[model samples]
Target: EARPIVVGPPPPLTKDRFYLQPLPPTEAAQRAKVSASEILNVKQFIDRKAWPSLQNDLRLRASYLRYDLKTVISAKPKDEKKSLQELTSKLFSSIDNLDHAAKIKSPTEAEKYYGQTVSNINEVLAKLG
Candidate 1:
């Protein structure tokens, strides 16, 4: 009759680790997202005051990094692949930021990010070559 005993759920017997079941997003998917962002940046730069050759070069570099070179780098040994992936991801992010600055007609801000993005690209190339 009276008060019944209230029992709470038992705690886990083992430590729980969070992990993506099945699989996490593939490298290709990550690369595609970054690539799309960088592409948007490139489009934003199209009407900027930057030199034609520089713009062309940046576009080419972005294309190669996103498409061709990414595949090549992905096929490398685990260490190299991981390194390149990190570097490229940074490069793409910087470029995307640079594009945002450019869109707002902030030359100084754009230039600063552009320098960092170029440095990232150079690091990637140095590692490859």
Candidate 2:
């Protein structure tokens, strides 16, 4: 009789090594620290124009959403560091999926994802504040 083949549990579906991937600080300076004004400007841009335009362009929607999400990630504060990191990680994963959806040219699905992405950004902003 032949011995039975032993199979172990399958590998994880995701390639990520850790739950919350480490993110570097958005900026570096020799002496002068980055000012709050710069981050505030990005916040304004995402709210006033970037996000709305993302809804308008179907072809580039996912790319724009990724950009805006990174901006928000960069603006996260140190006080609630872990909470913000975890939330942003979840949002980043969704954005990655949205990119795949956009690749297929599914306007309706992309639009829905876009809306959800905007909502997530708002929540992050609230938490940051």
Q: Name the best candidate (by lDDT).
A: 1
TM-score, cand. 1 vs. native: 0.53
- Tens digits of per-residue lDDT, candidate 1, 6-38, equal 234334331321212111224434544454445
Please give each candidate's TM-score: 0.53, 0.41
The RMSD of every model to the true structure, in order and in angstroms, is 16.2, 14.4
lDDT of 1 at 111: 74
* lDDT (10s digit) by residue, model 2, range 28-113: 11000122122223333233445433322322333333333454546656665577666666655555544444455556555555
Q: Residue 104 CA error for candidate 2 (Å)? A: 0.9
Q: Which whole-number lDDT from 0 to 100 does residue 49 have in model 2?
A: 41
